[PDB]
Write a protein that binds this ligand. Structure first.
Ligand SMILES: CCCCCS(=O)(=O)C[C@@H](NC(=O)c1cccnc1)C(=O)N[C@@H](Cc1cc(F)cc(F)c1)[C@H](O)CNCc1cccc(CC)c1
Length: 375
């Protein structure tokens, strides 16, 4: 938890958060997307219309070819590459250098984003979902094994021609107490592959969705910084929109809005936040029958793009995804050592005069264990 790591993240709305890193010798500078939703460290290693610079292996005296191809398909978008290792540093991170696995991207499809300003991706999740297989040690594992950095990192993602710029902090090796107020509440990491958690209850403006909690985690629920929106399984999505639509029936928007396709604008400064409800996601606590909740304001699920916004909540077919817009306003601790994820109100907390994002507990909930999907 260093003051030198504060504000070491940057990016544009809808295009994620990236941290500056150097690879090879001499140091090659690159902006790398911080993604707790995957486990491969990869960087553009060949020219591309959206890349202004890229990893040039031939210019690195410390590069070692692993002579193995690698391929990684995401929800939408994918890339192909060549494996190898090299020295990697995070200028605004811990003062150490480690030899890490790196997937030099040679071919890609709908992966890189035009104008995003990042040239690679840092999969911070576990080896289990790493490609080719789990023998390809993820970056953070190498960092912990090679240096004395504590097996833990925390993220503070903040809100907002060109798309609004965003800032944040990735504290490697610790917790920076000045980045949050109040208490930290932890939810167990159900399994060490994605950063899987369990949602046991959901409320829209204080009203219970009243669904079997297995639906909330239908398939799985993950904390994913590499994903923008709050993604919800079909049944949960529909209940959610119906509830949100009702609360804001005072005004009407085109179906494209709710489908997160087309934006919606209001006179600059007149956004009627008060008509949109708050969303409370209750997460399993560290104790049976006990949980805590994180409340999201409309300022979070209505992403800036007159003041224009897009509905940052969309239907998923691969489970719940607590994306960036959910993480924003909260200080999130990925306590790998103790297999848990802590949440707390962020210093750049979720605004508003009558309301505010919050992290509250405890709230008793029985049989939280049957909320998960049992393989
Ligand atoms: C951060 C910049 C914002 C980009 C806006 S986004 O549309 O929300 C990105 C999201 N896209 C969507 O969620 C999406 C996209 C289109 C339609 N519906 C949903 C997505 O796929 N995210 C990848 C990171 C990524 C970032 C990019 F910038 C471009 C890519 F290519 C990939 C996560 O790693 C996925 N974790 C779940 C997961 C799923 C499958 C396999 C794995 C094993 C690696 C893992």
């Amino acid at each position: 938890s260093f003051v030198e790591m504060v504000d070491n993240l940057r990016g544009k709305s809808g295009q994620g958060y990236y941290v500056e890193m150097t690879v090879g010798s001499p140091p090659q500078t690159l902006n790398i997307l911080v993604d707790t939703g995957s486990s491969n460290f990869a960087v553009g290693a060949a020219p591309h219309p959206f890349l202004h610079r890229y990893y040039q292996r031939q210019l690195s005296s410390t590069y070692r070819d692993l002579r193995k191809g690698v391929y990684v398909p995401y929800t939408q978008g994918k890339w192909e590459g060549e494996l190898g290792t090299d020295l990697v540093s995070i200028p605004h991170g811990p003062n150490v250098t480690v030899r890490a696995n790196i997937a030099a991207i040679t071919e890609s499809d709908k992966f890189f984003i035009n104008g995003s300003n990042w040239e690679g991706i840092l999969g911070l999740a576990y080896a289990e979902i790493a490609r080719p297989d789990d023998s390809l040690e993820p970056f953070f594992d190498s960092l912990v094994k090679q240096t004395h950095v504590p097996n833990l990192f925390s993220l503070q993602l903040c809100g907002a021609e060109v798309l609004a710029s965003v800032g944040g902090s990735m504290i490697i090796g610790g917790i920076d107490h000045s980045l949050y107020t109040g208490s930290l509440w932890y939810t167990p990491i159900r399994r060490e592959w994605y950063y899987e958690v369990i949602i046991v209850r959901v409320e829209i403006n204080g009203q219970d969705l009243k669904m079997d909690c297995k639906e909330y985690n239908y398939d799985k629920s993950i904390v994913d910084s590499g994903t923008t929106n709050l993604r919800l399984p079909k049944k949960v999505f529909e209940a959610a929109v119906k509830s949100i639509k009702a609360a804001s029936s005072t005004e009407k928007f085109p179906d494209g809005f709710w489908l997160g396709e087309q934006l919606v604008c209001w006179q600059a400064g007149t956004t009627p936040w008060n008509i949109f409800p708050v969303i409370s996601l209750y997460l399993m606590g560290e104790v049976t029958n006990q949980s805590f909740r994180i409340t999201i304001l409309p300022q979070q699920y209505l992403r800036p793009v007159d003041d224009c916004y897009k509905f940052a909540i969309s239907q998923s077919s691969t489970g719940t995804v607590m994306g960036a817009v959910i993480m924003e306003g909260f200080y999130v601790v990925f306590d790998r050592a103790r297999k848990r994820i802590g949440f707390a109100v962020s210093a750049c907390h979720v605004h508003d005069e009558f309301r505010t994002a919050a992290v509250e507990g405890p709230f008793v909930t029985l049989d939280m264990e049957d909320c998960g999907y049992n393989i």
